[PDB]
Amino acid sequence: AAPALKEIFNVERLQHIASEMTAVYPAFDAKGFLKHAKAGLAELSVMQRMARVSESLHAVIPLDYPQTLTLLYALAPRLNSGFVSLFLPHYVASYGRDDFKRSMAALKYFTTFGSAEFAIRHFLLHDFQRTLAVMQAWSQDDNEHVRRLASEGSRPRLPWSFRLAEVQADPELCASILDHLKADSSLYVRKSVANHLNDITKDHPEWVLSLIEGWNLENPHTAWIARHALRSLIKQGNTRALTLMGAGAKAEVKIHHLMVTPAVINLGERINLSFTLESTAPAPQKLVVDYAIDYVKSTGHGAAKVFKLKAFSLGAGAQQHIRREQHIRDMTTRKHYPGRHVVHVLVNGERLGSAEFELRA
DNA sequence: TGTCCAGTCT
DNA sequence: AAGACTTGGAC
Ligand SMILES: C[C@H](COCC(CO)(COC[C@@H](C)OC[C@@H](C)O)COC[C@@H](C)O)OC[C@@H](C)O
Ligand code: NA
User: Fold this and answer.
1) Checking CA distances to A31, which of A92, A158, A202, A347 falls within 20 to 30 Å?
2) What's the superkingdom here (predicted)?
3) In terms of C-beta distances under 8 Å and separation of at least 24 residues, what long-range contacts does A29-36 make, across chains too?
């Protein structure tokens, strides 16, 4: 097993931070910083450790906020880790609330060394309109890291941060940010636009569908964003979403040989889903082929869980074998329970057949 | 609770 | 990525 992520902020890293702080600030209280940062370190998760570094710096540095920021600007290029550098935007969000313009400039600078995606959300929470205006300017910045921040920091449902209830409730607030970026030349930016849009589909699917129905999907950057923005709705079999992908029509196919083997497994074994699709159409057709498992849970069953299989074009009268092995074992993100597990085959949003496997007690 | 979603490794 | 997740938010 690899070391846990929290070990990125181990004592050796804290010593590195202190040494580089001494390099930019000879009078730095490195001993006090280390004492403060190390207290209970083993009990701290990775994001607790990240925050702790910022707090420890604030506790021992006898300078004001602008003066400390000057040191931290010099510290940023000396750090040997982009993830570790998250404590720099954290310091701004913690101590910069009453020095807004300076703090915004600091986040724009620091975000290239890691990411200001967590820090900017504290400002969006406490000063939404003021911060939104800044992020609109950032969406037009020359630097792809700054444009990406504009999209990622404003996400309704960013992992490892609180949801932004104000954004989540009103997709028009950030709409112009995403519109500016819908054909961005940066893959980094495009990923963020797509993920922000996928977030929106959890609460306002029709708004995203209407938006993308207005897009020019002949632009391959925009088409790529559309496919990844709509990925949850596609798995749900949403007809408007599948239609945007060219796979909204009912599949003109027959399914043959559908099976799941073995019929009965112990936890830890693999299942094998296989079937053949035969076109019954006079021309090629675009297909989105997924599958779903109805897992047995501690009580009852979970909602059908959809996994991706294949997206492809099936020639007229052609047939295509499809096969997927899946390793069924307890995982951090899924515990399993014994009984009948039903597997459904999905083609352009339609269930075309099912099979079963038994998970033994 | 248990459950589900979500740049790097795989 | 496409899925799990070293980890975290939320229901
Ligand atoms: C915080 C982001 C993403 O983190 C990715 C890494 C990947 O292992 C940790 O994911 C752990 C996983 C359990 O979580 C899932 C994601 C969805 O949260 C950390 O990256 C390690 C290298 C960079 O040190 O990255 C911020 C940026 C400043 O790096
Ligand atoms: Na990984």
Assistant:
1) A92
2) Bacteria
3) A29/A60, A29/A61, A32/A59, A32/A60, A33/A57, A33/A59, A33/A60, A36/A60
Strands A350-359 and A264-265: parallel
Secondary structure of residue A337 in the 3-state scheme? coil
Q: Is the same domain home to A188 and A145?
A: yes
Within 10 Å of residue A20's Cβ, how many Cβ atoms? 18
Straight-line distance from CA A52 to C1' B6, in Å?
25
* Angstrom distance (rounded) from CA A130 to CA A122: 12
CB A261 within 8 A of CB A239: no
Positive or negative torsion for Cα A308, A326, A259, A302? negative
Best CA proximity match to A343, nearest among A298, A309, A299, A300: A309
Give the other-Cβ count within 10 Å of A324's Cβ.
Answer: 17
Domain boundary among A230, A246, A262: A246
Q: How were these coordinates obtained?
A: X-ray
Which two structure tokens, joined as six digits, stand for A159? Answer: 């992992």
Mapping DSSP to helix (H, G, I), strand (E, B) and coil, where does residue A247 land?
Answer: coil
Which residues line ligand 1 at a C-beta cut-off of 6 Å? A 5, 82-83, 86, 114-115, 159-160
Tell me the residue type at A247.
A
Q: At what angle do helices A65-75 and A87-95 cross, to 10 degrees?
A: 170
* Whole-angstrom distance, CA of residue A233 vs CA of residue A208: 10
Q: Is the CB atom of residue A201 positioned under 7 angstroms from any atom of strand B?
A: no
Structural domain of A219:
4-246
Q: Are A245 and A302 in contact (CB under 8 A)?
A: no
Q: Which of A200, A231, A246 marks a domain boundary? A: A246
User: Do A329 and A270 contact (CB within 8 A), yes or no?
Assistant: no
**Quick one: resolution in A?**
1.8
User: CA–C1' span, A342 to B9, in Å?
Assistant: 30
Same domain, A207 and A288: no
CB A291, CB A308: distance < 8 Å: no
- C-alpha A12 to ligand 2 mean position (Å): 23
Secondary structure (DSSP) of A58-102: HHH--S-HHHHHHHHHHHGGG-S-TTGGGHHHHHHHHH-TT-HHH
